[PDB]
Amino acid sequence: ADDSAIQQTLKKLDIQQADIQPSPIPGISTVMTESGVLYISADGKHLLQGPLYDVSGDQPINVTNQALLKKLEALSSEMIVYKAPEEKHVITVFTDITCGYCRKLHEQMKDYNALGITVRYLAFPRQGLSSQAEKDMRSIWCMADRNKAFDDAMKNNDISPATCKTDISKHYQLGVQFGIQGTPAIVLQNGTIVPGYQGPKEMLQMLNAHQASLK
Amino acid sequence: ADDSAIQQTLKKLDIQQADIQPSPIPGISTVMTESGVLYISADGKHLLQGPLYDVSGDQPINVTNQALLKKLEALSSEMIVYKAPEEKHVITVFTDITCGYCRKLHEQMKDYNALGITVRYLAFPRQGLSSQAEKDMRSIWCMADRNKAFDDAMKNNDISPATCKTDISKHYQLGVQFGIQGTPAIVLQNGTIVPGYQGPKEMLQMLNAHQASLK
Ligand SMILES: OC[C@H]1O[C@@](CO)(O[C@H]2O[C@H](CO)[C@@H](O)[C@H](O)[C@H]2O)[C@@H](O)[C@@H]1O
Structure with missing residues (x-):
């Protein structure tokens, strides 16, 4: 729960107002930014771009988009x-x-x-x-x-x-x-x-x- | 310890003749397919598309690309x-x-x-x-x-x-x-x-x- 290393990395990258939440992968956080979702390791060193897929089941699930659906629904009063x-x-x-x-x-x-x-x-x-x-x-x-x-x-x-x-x-x-x-x-x-x-x-x-x- | 979980996932996704290599991220493997690079968790449960960046330094490094450059140089006798x-x-x-x-x-x-x-x-x-x-x-x-x-x-x-x-x-x-x-x-x-x-x-x-x- 110490997203400090990630935040330091985001600052050096000059990304502001990003939301850092856990991902289903241990040691990696979901980072939602103003121009995309990022996946960053807890230590701040490594970075992949979204989307993240769950391919454990019969069909792939787009984890990132499922998460974004809730962001979509908080906007319902503005639709x-x-x-x-x-x-x-x-x-x-x-x-x-x-x-x-x-x-x-x-x-x-x-x-x-x-x-x-x-x-x-x-x-x-x-x-x-x-x-x-x-x-x-x-x-x-x-x-x-x-x-x-x-x-x-x-x-x-x-x-x-x-x-x-x-x-x-x-x-x-x-x-x-x-x-x-x-x-x-x-x-x-x-x-x-x-x-x-x-x-x-x-x-x-x-x-x-x-x-x-x-x- | 082996790559059975990943390979089984590769099978479900109809990914043939992929090459499973290390990655800098613990619990993640670099998977080179015929169409590009994938990053897949050890349990075969999760999948992220490349490229992977190392953002620990003053400047971002495209780790995926450095890995492809290694394959490039391996083809030098074919050039x-x-x-x-x-x-x-x-x-x-x-x-x-x-x-x-x-x-x-x-x-x-x-x-x-x-x-x-x-x-x-x-x-x-x-x-x-x-x-x-x-x-x-x-x-x-x-x-x-x-x-x-x-x-x-x-x-x-x-x-x-x-x-x-x-x-x-x-x-x-x-x-x-x-x-x-x-x-x-x-x-x-x-x-x-x-x-x-x-x-x-x-x-x-x-x-x-x-x-x-x-x-
Ligand atoms: O079958 C071609 C194969 O042979 C190698 C050597 O292992 O290259 C040799 O043959 C080439 C094709 O005729 C030549 O152009 C080259 O100069 C020669 O060394 C491999 O490079 C190639 O895959």
């Missing part, structure tokens, strides 16, 4: 949720309002919903945290009705500037930690990252096959 | 060597006789040599081990005079089919382990991979800066 009336599936989408495929996706929201697919958005500026995309998405996420603000944004209408204590930079960072490198990126209940756009029909097909629904 | 008469630098080049840039490089061999740069070749068919590029380069490397056969092949001469005691499968696999994305790919004495072509003048400047010639 813009488009709920399907009768809900068969729930996906979490990292989206960028400036992205043509994210637009294409969003334009069909009523169709995804009609097919039982609930969509939950987190902000992910492809061009990073200092982009206009980031600022405009910050305003959207600060509105009392995020859904309306998001809809109007996607309809190209002007975005009123707003700021509040909600920090969507944490959304971007979680996305980087999941290994996401573009939008839209789908997070399944089961932990899998599915890059890229899929229309309502393809999405449902993929979800019914890969995403167990006990129902 | 086609164009030695500079007054040697100041030595580079190792993964090359494909079908690659326009490797040809552009190879045509200037006298100019690299005159600048004191010795070039050593390993074969890297971009189209894999089942391609015609593999057959021709296997043929080249099998000749009593690899240098002449390589020259004549770059002069677009018909390469006579030829076999011997070895093929070039190990060259390709090493290149893949280094993570090489295309040709030519340059390996420095210091383990660094420098992708792509550089003319003799740019090459020398690059070496004099990054690869101290202590002599």
Whole structure:
């Protein structure tokens, strides 16, 4: 429980605000940083990049992503949720309002919903945290009705500037930690990252096959 | 005490003919596959992808790469060597006789040599081990005079089919382990991979800066 050597190493590496937790491997800690998950030996000497896999069972399990799912769920109050009336599936989408495929996706929201697919958005500026995309998405996420603000944004209408204590930079960072490198990126209940756009029909097909629904 | 737990894991993951070596981390083994390096716990339970860094010093060291450099040097007798008469630098080049840039490089061999740069070749068919590029380069490397056969092949001469005691499968696999994305790919004495072509003048400047010639 003395993460001092690791912290000293992180300082020399100039990594700040990293979260150091144990890993399933003895003598190695899970280090979650703003640009990825690291695995570092307790002595501070050795460093591997994520993800960590558990290949003990019949099928490999992505340990790192299972851990990140809990980080994903602590953001639920910051999600813009488009709920399907009768809900068969729930996906979490990292989206960028400036992205043509994210637009294409969003334009069909009523169709995804009609097919039982609930969509939950987190902000992910492809061009990073200092982009206009980031600022405009910050305003959207600060509105009392995020859904309306998001809809109007996607309809190209002007975005009123707003700021509040909600920090969507944490959304971007979680996305980087999941290994996401573009939008839209789908997070399944089961932990899998599915890059890229899929229309309502393809999405449902993929979800019914890969995403167990006990129902 | 043996590698049975790891090997059983390698079997489940359909990883054939891997080589299990030590690692600096207790309870972790370096596993060299045909496609790269893996780090796997002794119990076969966990798996991390390389590269492994040693970050104990003033500067990070890529431990994985230092291990691949050891295999690189083990292939020195398999290299086609164009030695500079007054040697100041030595580079190792993964090359494909079908690659326009490797040809552009190879045509200037006298100019690299005159600048004191010795070039050593390993074969890297971009189209894999089942391609015609593999057959021709296997043929080249099998000749009593690899240098002449390589020259004549770059002069677009018909390469006579030829076999011997070895093929070039190990060259390709090493290149893949280094993570090489295309040709030519340059390996420095210091383990660094420098992708792509550089003319003799740019090459020398690059070496004099990054690869101290202590002599
Ligand atoms: O079968 C080739 C095999 O032989 C070695 C020596 O063990 O190299 C010799 O044969 C080569 C191919 O004809 C020559 O180019 C080389 O000069 C000669 O020493 C190995 O290097 C090679 O794998």
